[PDB]
Design an enzyme around this catalytic site. Structure first.
Site, PDB file in Angstrom:
ATOM      1  N   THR D   1     -27.491  -4.358  36.159  1.00 30.99           N
ATOM      2  CA  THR D   1     -26.954  -4.867  37.413  1.00 30.99           C
ATOM      3  C   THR D   1     -26.104  -6.104  37.135  1.00 30.99           C
ATOM      4  OG1 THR D   1     -28.877  -4.046  38.639  1.00 30.99           O
ATOM      5  CG2 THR D   1     -27.473  -5.644  39.725  1.00 30.99           C
ATOM      6  N   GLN D   2     -24.790  -5.969  37.322  1.00 27.93           N
ATOM      7  CA  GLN D   2     -23.858  -6.967  36.804  1.00 27.93           C
ATOM      8  C   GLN D   2     -23.776  -8.200  37.703  1.00 27.93           C
ATOM      9  OE1 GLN D   2     -20.313  -4.560  36.403  1.00 27.93           O
ATOM     10  NE2 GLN D   2     -20.829  -3.965  34.300  1.00 27.93           N
ATOM     11  N   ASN D   3     -23.586  -7.973  38.998  1.00 25.99           N
ATOM     12  CA  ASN D   3     -23.599  -9.051  39.979  1.00 25.99           C
ATOM     13  C   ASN D   3     -24.486  -8.717  41.172  1.00 25.99           C
ATOM     14  OD1 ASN D   3     -23.043 -11.351  41.470  1.00 25.99           O
ATOM     15  ND2 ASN D   3     -20.834 -11.280  41.069  1.00 25.99           N
ATOM     16  N   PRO D 105     -30.274  -1.801  33.969  1.00 30.69           N
ATOM     17  CA  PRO D 105     -31.445  -2.664  34.131  1.00 30.69           C
ATOM     18  C   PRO D 105     -31.626  -3.104  35.569  1.00 30.69           C
ATOM     19  CG  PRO D 105     -29.650  -3.945  33.292  1.00 30.69           C
ATOM     20  CD  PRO D 105     -29.139  -2.531  33.383  1.00 30.69           C
TER      21      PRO D 105
END
Lengths: 235, 246, 201, 216, 198, 213, 232, 240, 234
Positions: D1-3, D105
């Site tokens: 999960t990037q942002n 993730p």
């Protein structure tokens, strides 16, 4: 005669014949017993000899440090369940990092052995089991069947001529709780001799045991380690 | 799965002969009689028609004579239903060959490619076999003219003159006597096939509606598959009928 | 990483150094690059240490399966082909290995070079590794098929000794493996630094 | 999960004599905004263990839902077995890791408190699967702020009472309110003891701003 | 890059190739033979990425040898060309692209001599002469000037020696020794290897 | 985006003596410039004679250890005996290699006693290569530890000096002192020390104090 | 798909499908073979020739590779499969091992197919008995026989198919070391062997020979007739 | 003659025998009852002791499907443990999908559909397990639903499954359970079972009971020690 | 024929497994013997005709350097296990870098004995159990070991066994003549003395084969030149 050949065919009496015939497979093999005190839980299995020259089958298998089983049934068919039980006990220590509860492990067997009884073209596992284990709730002795119905028992006997060994365990039931390590094992050893005729006795070769308890992990005594328990018991 | 309902089509007999293959050959035994003759120039296929009525349209083509490839053709003796499955497979096989190798498919290569399909159904799968036995004609750059006869078991072979279908045993005995190796010409072959059928026809007088002839010749580097029209067929019959007396 | 092999009248000779380093820091020193496979087959090590070490073990596994099944005691030519076919199905995934397969088969003193991408080359003389170029110079210095046994080892020593001296990623001790009809035998394991001050007088 | 959308904030916890206390802001934070100003970031797990988390809140209600089924499905059998906070901790360590090895993730950081068998378990997991156990924990910038406040007490006084604990938690939450941008005044103090998990209502901190006159 | 060449005479197909096998800055194997024999009268010449040449061209050699055993007669040089294409073409879009350059040289009882060009994108072309590699730029010009359809194998080898000795002057890579083979009605025949003992 | 690996520090040192094998590591678990906790033993026990260190990303150190301890039981149940030190190396070589495309980032050093009763140290790489050696190191301080051992253990660069096999009495003080030297000059090492000595009798764990800063 | 047990055991332990498969071989076209010194000979009798047939497409003596040939007796529909499956293995072997195919190596693969199709779900056992012949490296002749069950042996001389019993009765007596000295008497032994299955006939006899590195050679009806001319 | 060999066949009279045979598997099973009152739902079961060797509480026939849902099974217990595990999957899928307590009317549907899917085919056999599902909610009230091997679901004020039915279904009709309170129902449930239970074939059993209703705040529980002892003694005093 | 492969008889035993053991009685006699110094293996070739070549029939195969084998019953079914046993032995040597003990080899092949089944299977599943019984001799760190396998999947440790056409006649006389410490050379003679009488055709060098294995020497099969001296001492 038509109702016999299939697992999924009922009868006029509501009885599944193949599951009944799979129960006969348990009566076709060596007898095993086990019982638990407030602490220890000990399995005693009689290793059968194909001949005096050939060695004895292994009737007791490790599963996890705190759990062990005594197989009575088709030998190579029990290694399918034992391999399943070992994977479930490793997945419990790999995920939750805790010893798997014995009441849970037997429930997974009830789910695994239920499917072949349900579906057509498959056969029910012909192996009965006694699962001895120790957990936070105390020691446990669990019987299973080919019918997938599993019990919760103080002491049981499965295999050929097991009814006599069950009768012995009932009379001494009240004493099973306070027995120490040695005396507890002696109760099971006295059960096996009742199953076999008097022409055969207990020896270091044909008898294997296992012990799980509070401070002691499940361990299998093969031959020379069986002798100290065999000695001191009148036959 | 309920085996009870399973007939076990792929099992051997006590004498070692597949049932569904033998019973398929008796289905072919009552089907339309087809024959072929290999001559010095050209090869022919004479197919008898077992469906004839005043109300039949005859819309398509030779009706039991197909075309597998530009260079090849086939007749059919057997169940008319299952033949349309094979023909659609043979037309895929020749076009998969032509796709890779960019040359016309030789007759030996196409026949043995289909008989592999007739094996899968007889050997395994549990499904019933094909009730269709075929004749083959064609030309290739190597062995020249070819005449092949398969069966529902997938057993084929080359033939100079053959027959298939109803009264196929009585026809071959006639070919063996009359057919001469290397001495046959398409003009002498057509006159032969008519004499063979006229004895084996269950209906006499040999009407132009029943028997239909398909010939295959190679001219100007191109294979020519022609189905003789009812005009020329009847002309060959009348020429054969005058030779019976005059 | 410097490795070389050559064949002559009396058979093949393989020579490697012991060093394998990561970056500027030398990881280990005495690492043995030459891989043993069969009694009479001998592999080498080049590129990624774990890749060629792993896949050479499969070749040691497949050569055993061949000898158990057929009993024909696999030739060097076929054993070189098995190692290439295994590396060709993983191509593009970043496996880096060089290698050489030496041995004596019915035909003769076969020697091959099997690469990461499937390059398979027989021949008289080969060298691999980062310091491979430094080896060819000394080996081409008048090596001849008519050399005796003692004259051949002196070339194997002097090749690696001068190869690791010029190369900073090559060094350690020189491992020399002679080849015969029966099987390989280890000639010596000798420090480069001790051989330098010999040849330097 | 990037942002992750709607990140959490620091989560303080520290084990005192016969119990564990976990403090967490009630502020959900979307970007730099303070958007959802009343949320419960501390979940009660069974009787004896207590969970609160940081990072993505949408991933916290997913684990809130999964652990809910895990504990409820466990109660349905009635076998007497209840997940110890070490099992809840080692289970999350796998969930965080298995999502990682798939390159998908769950962006999150969790602090599992609990008191079982007279042994107080305070524990920590991470997105990447890094997991350990410490006498005092914090997430996000709490590890840079209130962590040396907790360690400075535990080095001098390794044994803290229940009253001294909350006082030190109120001080550390007070410092986060001062020194953390995404923090907020209203927070929950949830203290798990042998009497069971008890989540106190929204609290606040008495703040001394009188140094604003000194700077002038 | 490795070098290939071929020449089609009226009765014959004269092909040649470089024997060098090179890696990094050194020449590993100077006698490496790049001429792969598909059938009796059918050769094949493959250069490209070091691993893709031997790996692919062996998949063809077996399919060609297999066809001859199945039907009793070998493929013609025409069918063998369109078969190597479709395999090399189907690879392109899959996860295992091959980078190769082929020359299919063969003789036929009817069609006669044939020579085929192919690139790594599997575009088949039938030319009287062809070449691959960086040496194909310095050579095919010479072939343009001296080639004739009536050429004789005595002239062809002499013509081939004019081309190959000019890779020793302008062309930068060594290429000391060149293998040469000829195909006729009697099958493949080896010719004296052109060698320039530098 | 998402960075799957982080460097948690840690240092592992192994020395194989005649009768003994020592595996020591520090306790500090730190990501970035912050210290998560000052007790995080790197040394993990496999069998009675085998101690494995894991230096690298801590999440892989925890996962790989649970995978090894799972296949120790898969071996012990199938083969009815414990894995030899050489078998653990060969297994963990294939375990680390099955991740070849997405490798574990860890430095494994296995030490203990072999079938001969002699100290056997197997040092690995994340990709699964392994070789036996008398002494190895790992982690951030690996570069500082190795030169000290080449001198004291290897007697290198000294002309005409007797070669005496290293004694456990000298080995205890040798492992402690290189860390007292490393923990000073390395920021990823300190706060404590855990020495696990593997002898024929059994594992003895000894804790040493290091600079706390 | 269709998964069901076709081949199963019996109260007598016999496999019906495998025994009934061998019944298909028990009526074949008789195929024989012998081993000489440098030469090896195969032969087969065809009673089905009406003179209308094309003799070339019905030939039951095939070639798996340059160094190996084979014959069969049984149901011909099943032989095409095994042969086309064996020829794929010969070439895949030269791709795996640069050396040619050993006569034994291709006989194993033919046997491993007849096994798998015995135990597989919803299959049928092959009805063919294949007789494999070739020269291994160093030039030693080898003659093998397969079985629908998957059991392969070796033989100096052998006969399969219909009437294979009476042929062996002639072979076992007349096969000696003083025989098979010359290439003609080795061929003359095969033709004499087929005399037991001769119908008062033998213009239908097919023969094949292999010598050293030379490929398979099938004798025409003229070449065989010269060998027949010498009897008394 | 062959019409009853599989669940995929109709008799010439239209009955499916393999489903009717699975019902007789319940007719030989021990008797279990359930009852509704104003306050909630009460369960009772006769759990037969086959041997003294069996631990007290083994082969428990009262399953907890969800916190607020109880379950009581009569039939082959092997198939029952599969249903109780599948009924939990439906309650957990409901909790996951719709995020609140599954209404008993809907939970007795999905389950009665799964029981039904095995009467259609020839590759499976019908369940031999008949079971009832009680539940309580403040916004719903006492609800009791029985499911049989065929998958038929009915609501009941009181019901009897297993061997004794018509005997137990008559004894429940005499008492009026609508206005009564659960604390007074528990005493009547045990009173019914001992009246229904007669010892000829079997020997001994263990009385099992369950609370769901106002007393438990909606959470399904087994009757606590003191109340179970308080209730069992009353049925013994009322026995004569 | 009315009775699946997985159907239990009313006696509690699988039919197909009950029938598979009935197929062992038709095999060839194979006699294993264990000794503290090694394991001896002898089996009858059963040559069916003078024209047959005896060298091509090998009923004793080498599973690994330290492990021999033997087979009786259907020889066709044996190849599936033998080729599987050789892979499992090499899989172990590859992974754990040590020779797989004879115990783990049997657990590898015995797991495939009950894998047969019809429904809920793969294309690689089997419709019938194996009709072959194997005897694995071998030497490991536990000393020379000899095991027995039947179609039921039950592997049994044994000091000696007899399988094939006559097990009863051989097992009767084998338990007698086998005493404790008796060495290899004595076992070989006692093996042939039993084997020579239980067969039909006379004992020849090429008529039967013999194998042995030692702790310090790899698995070895006696050639014809060595057997001619052994049959001389009969």
């Amino acid at each position: 005669n038509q109702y016999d050949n299939d697992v999924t065919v009922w009868s006029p009496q509501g009885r599944i014949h193949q599951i009944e015939y799979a129960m006969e497979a348990v009566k076709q093999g060596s007898a095993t017993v086990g019982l638990k005190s407030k602490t220890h839980a000990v399995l005693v299995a009689l290793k059968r000899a194909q001949s005096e020259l050939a060695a004895h089958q292994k009737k007791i298998l490790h599963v996890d440090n705190h759990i062990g089983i005594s197989i009575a049934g088709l030998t190579a068919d029990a290694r399918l369940l034992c391999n399943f039980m070992r994977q479930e006990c490793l997945d419990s220590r790999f995920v939750f990092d805790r010893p798997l509860p014995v009441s849970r492990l037997v429930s997974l067997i009830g789910s695994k052995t239920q499917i072949p009884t349900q579906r057509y073209g498959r056969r029910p596992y012909g192996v009965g089991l006694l699962i001895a284990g120790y957990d936070d709730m105390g020691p446990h002795i669990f019987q299973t069947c080919p019918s997938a119905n599993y019990f919760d028992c103080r002491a049981m006997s499965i295999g050929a001529r097991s009814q006599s060994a069950r009768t012995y365990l009932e009379r001494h039931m009240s004493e099973f709780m306070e027995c120490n390590l040695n005396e507890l094992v002696k109760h099971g050893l006295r059960a096996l001799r009742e199953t076999l005729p008097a022409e055969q006795d207990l020896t270091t070769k044909n008898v294997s045991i296992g012990i799980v308890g509070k401070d002691l992990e499940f361990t299998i005594y093969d031959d020379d380690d069986v002798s100290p328990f065999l000695e001191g018991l009148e036959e | 799965m309920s085996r009870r309902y399973d007939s076990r089509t792929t099992i051997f007999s006590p004498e070692g002969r597949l049932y569904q293959v033998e019973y398929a050959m008796e289905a072919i035994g009552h089907a339309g009689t087809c024959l072929g003759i290999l001559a010095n120039d050209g090869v022919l296929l004479a197919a008898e028609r077992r469906n004839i009525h005043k109300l039949l349209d005859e819309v398509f083509f030779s009706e039991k004579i197909y075309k597998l490839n530009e260079d090849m053709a086939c007749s059919v003796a057997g169940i008319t239903s299952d033949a349309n499955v094979l023909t659609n497979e043979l037309r895929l096989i020749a076009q998969r060959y032509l796709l890779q190798y960019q040359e016309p498919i030789p007759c030996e290569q196409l026949v043995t490619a289909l008989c592999d399909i007739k094996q899968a159904y007889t050997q395994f799968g549990g499904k019933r076999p094909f009730g269709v036995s075929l004749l083959y004609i064609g030309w290739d750059k190597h062995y020249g003219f070819q005449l092949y006869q398969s069966d529902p078991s997938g057993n084929y072979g080359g033939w100079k003159a053959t027959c298939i279908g109803n009264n196929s045993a009585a026809a071959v005995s006639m070919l063996k006597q009359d057919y001469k190796e290397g001495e046959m010409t398409l003009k002498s072959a057509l006159a032969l096939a008519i004499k063979v059928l006229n004895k084996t026809m269950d209906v006499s007088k040999l009407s132009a509606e029943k028997v239909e002839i398909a010939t295959l010749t190679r001219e100007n580097g191109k294979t020519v598959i022609r189905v003789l029209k009812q005009k020329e067929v009847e002309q060959l019959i009348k020429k054969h009928e005058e030779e019976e007396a005059k | 990483t410097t490795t070389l092999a050559f064949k002559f009248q009396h058979g093949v000779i393989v020579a490697v150094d012991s060093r394998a380093s990561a970056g500027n820091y030398i990881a280990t020193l005495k690492v043995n690059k030459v891989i043993e496979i069969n009694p009479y087959l001998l592999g080498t090590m080049s590129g990624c240490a774990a890749d060629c070490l792993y896949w050479e073990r499969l070749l040691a596994k497949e050569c055993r399966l061949y000898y158990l099944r057929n009993g024909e005691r696999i030739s060097v030519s076929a054993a070189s082909k098995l190692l290439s076919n295994m590396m060709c199905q993983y191509r593009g995934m970043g496996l880096s290995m060089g290698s050489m397969i030496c041995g004596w088969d019915k035909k003769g003193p076969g020697l091959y070079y099997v690469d990461e991408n499937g390059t398979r080359l027989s021949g008289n003389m080969f060298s691999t590794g980062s310091g491979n170029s430094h080896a060819y110079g000394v080996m081409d210095s008048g090596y001849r098929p008519d050399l005796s046994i003692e004259e051949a080892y002196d070339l194997g020593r002097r090749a690696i000794v001068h190869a690791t001296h010029r190369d900073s990623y090559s060094g350690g001790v020189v491992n020399m493996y002679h080849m015969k009809e029966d099987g390989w035998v280890k000639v010596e394991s000798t420090d480069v630094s001790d051989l330098m001050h010999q040849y330097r007088e | 999960t990037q942002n992750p959308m709607v990140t959490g904030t620091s989560v303080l916890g520290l084990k005192f004599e016969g119990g564990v206390v976990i403090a967490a802001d009630m502020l959900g934070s979307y970007g730099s905004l303070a958007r959802f100003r009343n949320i419960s970031r501390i979940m009660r797990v069974n009787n004896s263990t207590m969970l609160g988390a940081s990072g993505d809140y949408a991933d916290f209600q997913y684990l809130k839902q999964v652990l809910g089924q895990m504990v409820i499905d466990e109660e349905l059998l009635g076998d007497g077995h209840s997940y110890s906070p070490k099992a809840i901790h080692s289970w999350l360590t796998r969930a965080m890791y298995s999502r990682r090895s798939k390159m998908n993730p769950l962006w999150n950081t969790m602090v599992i408190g609990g008191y079982a068998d007279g042994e107080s378990f305070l524990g920590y997991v991470d997105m990447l699967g890094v997991a350990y156990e410490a006498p005092s924990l914090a997430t996000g910038y709490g590890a840079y702020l209130a962590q040396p406040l907790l360690r400075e007490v535990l080095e001098k006084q390794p044994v803290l009472s229940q009253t001294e604990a909350r006082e030190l938690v109120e001080r550390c939450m007070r410092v986060l309110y001062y020194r953390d941008a995404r923090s907020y005044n209203r927070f929950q103090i949830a203290t798990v003891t042998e009497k069971g998990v008890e989540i106190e209502g929204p609290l606040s901190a008495e703040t001394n701003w009188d140094i604003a006159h000194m700077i002038s | 890059m490795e070098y290939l060449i071929g020449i089609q005479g009226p009765d014959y197909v004269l092909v040649a190739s470089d024997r060098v096998a090179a890696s990094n800055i050194v020449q590993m194997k100077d006698d490496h033979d790049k001429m792969f024999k598909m059938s009796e009268k059918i050769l094949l010449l493959c250069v490209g990425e070091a691993g893709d040449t031997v790996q692919f061209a062996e998949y063809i050699q077996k399919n060609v040898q297999l066809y001859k055993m199945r039907n009793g007669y070998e493929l013609s040089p025409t069918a063998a060309a369109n078969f190597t294409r479709r395999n090399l073409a189907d690879y392109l879009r899959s996860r295992t692209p091959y980078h190769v350059n082929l020359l299919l040289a063969g003789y036929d009882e009817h069609e006669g001599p044939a020579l085929y060009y192919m690139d790594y994108l599997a575009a088949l072309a039938k030319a009287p002469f062809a070449a691959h590699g960086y040496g194909a730029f310095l050579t095919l010009s010479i072939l343009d000037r001296y080639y004739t359809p009536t050429i004789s194998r005595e002239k062809a080898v002499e013509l081939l020696r004019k081309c190959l000795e000019e890779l020793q002057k302008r062309f930068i890579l060594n290429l000391p020794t060149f293998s040469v083979r000829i195909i006729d009605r009697n099958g493949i025949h080896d010719l004296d290897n052109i060698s320039f003992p530098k | 985006r998402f960075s799957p690996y982080a460097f948690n520090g840690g240092t592992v040192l192994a020395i194989a003596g005649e009768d003994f094998s020592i595996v020591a590591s520090d306790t500090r678990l730190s990501e970035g410039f912050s210290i998560h906790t000052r007790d995080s033993p790197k040394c993990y026990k496999l069998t009675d004679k085998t101690v494995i260190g894991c230096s690298g990303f801590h999440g892989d150190c925890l996962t790989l250890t649970k995978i090894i301890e799972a296949r120790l039981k898969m071996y012990k149940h199938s083969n009815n005996k414990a894995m030899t030190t050489g078998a653990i190396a060969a297994m963990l070589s294939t375990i680390l290699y099955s991740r070849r495309f997405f490798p574990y980032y860890v430095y494994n050093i296995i030490g203990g006693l072999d079938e001969e009763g002699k100290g056997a140290v197997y040092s690995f790489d994340p990709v699964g290569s392994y070789q036996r050696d008398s002494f190895k190191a790992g982690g951030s301080a690996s570069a500082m530890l190795q030169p000290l051992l080449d001198n004291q253990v290897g007697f290198k660069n000294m002309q005409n000096v007797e070669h005496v096999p290293l004694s456990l009495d000298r080995a205890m003080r040798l492992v402690k002192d290189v860390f007292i030297s490393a923990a000073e000059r390395d920021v990823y090492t300190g706060d404590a020390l855990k020495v696990c000595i593997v002898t024929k009798e059994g594992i003895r764990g000894e804790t040493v104090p290091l600079r706390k800063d | 798909s269709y998964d069901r047990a076709i081949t199963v055991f019996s109260p007598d332990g016999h496999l019906f499908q495998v025994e009934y498969a061998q019944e298909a071989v028990k009526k074949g076209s008789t195929a024989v073979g012998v081993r000489g010194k440098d030469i090896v000979v195969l032969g087969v009798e065809k009673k089905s020739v009406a003179k209308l047939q094309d003799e070339r497409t019905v030939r039951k003596i095939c070639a798996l590779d340059d160094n190996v040939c084979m014959a069969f007796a049984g149901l011909t529909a099943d032989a095409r499969i095994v042969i086309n499956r064996a020829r794929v293995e010969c070439q895949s072997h030269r791709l795996t091992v640069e050396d040619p195919v050993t006569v034994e190596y291709i006989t194993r693969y033919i046997a491993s197919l007849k096994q798998r199709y015995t135990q597989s779900n919803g299959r049928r056992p092959f009805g063919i008995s294949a007789l494999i012949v070739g020269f291994d490296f160093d030039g030693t002749p080898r003659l093998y026989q397969t079985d629908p069950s998957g059991t392969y042996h070796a033989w100096k001389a052998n006969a399969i198919g219909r009437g294979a019993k009476s042929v062996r009765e002639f072979l076992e007596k007349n096969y000696t070391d003083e025989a098979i000295e010359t290439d003609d008497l080795t061929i003359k032994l095969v033709i004499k062997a087929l005399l037991e299955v001769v119908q008062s006939g033998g213009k239908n006899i097919e023969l094949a020979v292999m010598r050293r590195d030379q490929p398979l050679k099938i004798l025409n009806p003229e070449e065989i007739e010269k060998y027949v001319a010498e009897i008394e | 003659t062959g019409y009853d060999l599989s669940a995929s066949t109709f008799s010439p009279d239209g009955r499916v025998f393999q489903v009717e045979y699975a019902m007789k598997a319940v007719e030989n099973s021990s008797t279990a009852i359930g009852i509704r009152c104003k306050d909630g739902v009460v369960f009772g079961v006769e759990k037969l002791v086959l041997s003294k060797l069996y631990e007290e509480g083994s082969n428990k026939r009262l399953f907890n499907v969800d916190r607020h849902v109880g379950m009581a099974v009569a039939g082959l217990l092997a198939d029952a443990r599969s249903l109780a595990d599948i009924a939990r999957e439906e309650a957990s899928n409901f909790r996951s999908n719709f995020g609140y307590n599954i209404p008993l009317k809907h939970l007795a549907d999905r389950v009665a559909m799964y029981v039904h899917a095995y009467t259609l085919y020839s590759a499976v056999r019908p369940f031999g397990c008949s079971f009832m599902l009680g539940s309580y909610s403040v916004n719903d009230g006492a609800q009791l639903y029985m499911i049989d091997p065929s998958g038929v679901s009915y609501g009941y004020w009181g019901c009897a499954i297993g061997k004794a039915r018509q005997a137990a279904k008559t004894e429940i009709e005499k008492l009026q359970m609508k206005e009564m309170t659960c604390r007074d129902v528990v005493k009547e449930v045990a009173k019914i079972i001992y009246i229904v239970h007669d010892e000829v074939k079997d020997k001994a059993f263990e009385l099992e009971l369950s609370w769901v209703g106002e007393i438990t705040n909606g959470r399904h529980e087994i009757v606590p020690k003191d109340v179970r002892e308080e209730a069992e003694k009353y049925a013994k005093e009322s026995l004569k | 024929y009315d009775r699946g492969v997985n159907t239990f008889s009313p006696e509690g035993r699988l039919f197909q497994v009950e029938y598979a053991i009935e197929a062992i009685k038709l095999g060839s006699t194979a006699i294993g013997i264990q000794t503290s110094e090694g394991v001896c293996l002898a089996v009858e070739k059963r040559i069916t005709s003078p024209l047959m070549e005896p060298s091509s029939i090998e009923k004793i195969v080498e599973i690994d350097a330290h492990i021999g084998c033997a087979m009786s019953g259907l020889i066709a079914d044996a190849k599936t296990l033998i080729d599987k046993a050789r892979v499992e032995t090499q899989n172990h040597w590859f992974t754990y870098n040590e020779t797989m003990t004879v115990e783990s080899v049997t657990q590898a092949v015995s797991n495939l004995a009950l894998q047969f089944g019809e429904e809920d299977a793969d294309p690689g599943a089997m419709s019938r159990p194996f009709g072959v019984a194997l005897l694995f001799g071998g030497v490991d760190e536990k000393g020379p070991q000899l095991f027995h396998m039947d179609p039921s999947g039950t592997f049994v440790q044994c000091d000696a066994r007899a399988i094939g056409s006559a097990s009863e006649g051989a097992q009767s006389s084998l338990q007698e003549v086998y005493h404790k410490s008796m060495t290899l050379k004595e076992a070989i003679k006692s093996s042939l003395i039993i084997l020579k009488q239980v067969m039909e055709e006379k004992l020849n060098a090429t008529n039967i084969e013999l194998a042995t294995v030692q702790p310090g020497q790899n698995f070895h099969m006696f050639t014809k030149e060595e057997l001619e001296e052994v049959i001389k001492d009969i």
